[PDB]
Amino acid sequence: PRTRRRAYLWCKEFLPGAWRGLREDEFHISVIRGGLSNMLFQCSLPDTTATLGDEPRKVLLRLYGAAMVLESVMFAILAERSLGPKLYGIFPQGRLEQFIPSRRLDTEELSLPDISAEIAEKMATFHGMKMPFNKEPKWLFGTMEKYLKEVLRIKFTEESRIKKLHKLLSYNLPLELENLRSLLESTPSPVVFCHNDCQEGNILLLEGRENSEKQKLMLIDFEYSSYNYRGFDIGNHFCEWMYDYSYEKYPFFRANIRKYPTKKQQLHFISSYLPAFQNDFENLSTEEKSIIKEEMLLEVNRFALASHFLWGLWSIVQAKISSIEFGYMDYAQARFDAYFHQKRKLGV
Numbered sequence: 001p002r003t004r005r006r007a008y009l010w011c012k013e014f015l016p017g018a019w020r021g022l023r024e025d026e027f028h029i030s031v032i033r034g035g036l037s038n039m040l041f042q043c044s045l046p047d048t049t050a051t052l053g054d055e056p057r058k059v060l061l062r063l064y065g066a067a068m069v070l071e072s073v074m075f076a077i078l079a080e081r082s083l084g085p086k087l088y089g090i091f092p093q094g095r096l097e098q099f100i101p102s103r104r105l106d107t108e109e110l111s112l113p114d115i116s117a118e119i120a121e122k123m124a125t126f127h128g129m130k131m132p133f134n135k136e137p138k139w140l141f142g143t144m145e146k147y148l149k150e151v152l153r154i155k156f157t158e159e160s161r162i163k164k165l166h167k168l169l170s171y172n173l174p175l176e177l178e179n180l181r182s183l184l185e186s187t188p189s190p191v192v193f194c195h196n197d198c199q200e201g202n203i204l205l206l207e208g209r210e211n212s213e214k215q216k217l218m219l220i221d222f223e224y225s226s227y228n229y230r231g232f233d234i235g236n237h238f239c240e241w242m243y244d245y246s247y248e249k250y251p252f253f254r255a256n257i258r259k260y261p262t263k264k265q266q267l268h269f270i271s272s273y274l275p276a277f278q279n280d281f282e283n284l285s286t287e288e289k290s291i292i293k294e295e296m297l298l299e300v301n302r303f304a305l306a307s308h309f310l311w312g313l314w315s316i317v318q319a320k321i322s323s324i325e326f327g328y329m330d331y332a333q334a335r336f337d338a339y340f341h342q343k344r345k346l347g348v
């Protein structure tokens with residue numbers, strides 16, 4: 001399109017070497033993810049054109065479509081620190097990032113011992129770093145209260161969605177949030193820099209590193225990241241073991257309660273997290289380690305309720321406003337079913 005030109009100009013003007021002197025009739029762009037927001041494209045030199053210096057042959061273009069300062073600063077910082085794709089270009093419409101040869105993980109891979117251990121280690125790393133953002137943990141209850149406010153105001157026109165929403169509203173979401181509030185306020189959890197969306201779709205498996213045991217993954221997509229309770233980040237990740245967003249028919253996901261990590265799988269994950277986060281931890285006694293882990297299991301199982309609640313509310317608002325083809329109302333109902341299931345399991 002016209003879009004094609006613009007993208008050519010971005011690459012020509014922002015990228016070094018071969019790119020600088022490149023013609024419009026040599027530009028290779030393809031869609032990776034279309035839509036109206038956060039569109040993703042692959043852009044590349046002709047296979048035929050040689051590279052002057054260090055310039056990449058392929059880049060990823062992200063377009064904002066339809067807090068900008070914050071996300072940009074964070075992405076740049078993560079690039080500088082080698083915990084994210086390099087930033088090659090930034091502009092009002094979007095950015096040019098490094099193209100990492102890789103694929104996203106699938107849902108079932110989250111439970112593989114070595115994958116899970118590395119995710120825990122990466123999360124521990126992310127959690128231990130300093131970022132120029134507000135350190136007060138207002139994000140969790142702030143976001144829930146914001147989405148709850150939207151939810152309570154939403155009017156659907158179509159009858160199907162009116163009834164689905166009516167069933168969700170019948171839980172008494174305001175009162176249930178206060179129930180969650182008293183539970184979580186009685187559960188100490190350290191405030192750390194949280195990814196807040198640590199799912200398979202945000203975890204790259206690096207090409208050529210598949211044989212590495214401990215270093216084959218990169219966490220990406222920090223758009224929800226904030227200082228938050230560590231319980232949320234781990235609990236949210238555990239919840240993600242149940243949800244597979246690759247299903248190709250309506251509602252475009254599958255939920256499987258049975259796939260929530262067992263006590264053993266949770267212990268495996270936190271056994272890998274804790275030494276990467278707490279430098280002393282390795283040197284503690286067996287009983288002290290055991291005490292910490294048992295406490296941490298209670299912590300993250302309770303914060304998993306907020307994952308269900310927050311993303312359930314979020315998903316209701318998305319049904320009203322999103323352009324993505326996804327069964328948002330059914331996903332909201334699946335999160336709320338898991339919320340009540342997890343409360344029954346915990347006895348809270």
Ligand SMILES: COc1cccc(NC(=O)[C@H]2CC[C@@H](n3cnc4c(N)nc(-c5ccncc5)nc43)CC2)c1
Pocket residue numbers: 032033034040060085097098099100101102103104201202204220221
């Ligand atoms: C609707 O189809 C989709 C939706 C999202 C992502 C994808 N495809 C991929 O993620 C593939 C594996 C990773 C590939 N990749 C190489 N470098 C990448 C980069 N820097 N970012 C992302 C990326 C960014 C935000 N969300 C998902 C992936 N992806 C990068 C792109 C192709 C396909």
Ligand SMILES: [Mg+2]
Pocket residue numbers: 201202221
């Ligand atoms: Mg994402």
